[PDB]
Amino acid sequence: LGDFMDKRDASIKEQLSGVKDTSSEVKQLEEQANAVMRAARAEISAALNKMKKETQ
């Protein structure tokens, strides 16, 4: 019975941690996506400027 109690409690605590783990993983995913999108935009802008300046 002691083992059963432990198993159930661990299963629940583990579920909470995983749920906590998943939330952090999704926050990281969102941050990475945001950073990547910024790079695209900024990168291209810089490119044109440098390219625009060279053309000029």
Binding site: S23, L29, E30, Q32, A33, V36, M37, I44, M51, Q56
Partner: protein
């Protein structure tokens, strides 16, 4: 307690993945923007030269 961690992890990953997906898309917009800008700069350079050649010819006139 269990329902919380899972939600955090679910929501969290939905968000990291989403953020990086947005990064990719931008990586796309910028990529697009860079091409457009490059083409515009070439055309603008073309503008200058063409018009100044016109100005030359008018000077010759």
């Amino acid at each position: 307690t269990i329902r919380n961690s899972e939600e955090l992890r679910g929501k969290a990953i939905e968000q990291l993945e989403k953020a990086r997906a947005r990064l990719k898309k931008v990586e796309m917009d910028a990529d697009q923007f860079r091409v457009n800008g490059y083409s515009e700069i070439e055309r603008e350079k073309m503008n200058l030269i063409n018009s100044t050649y016109k100005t030359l010819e008018q000077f010759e006139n």
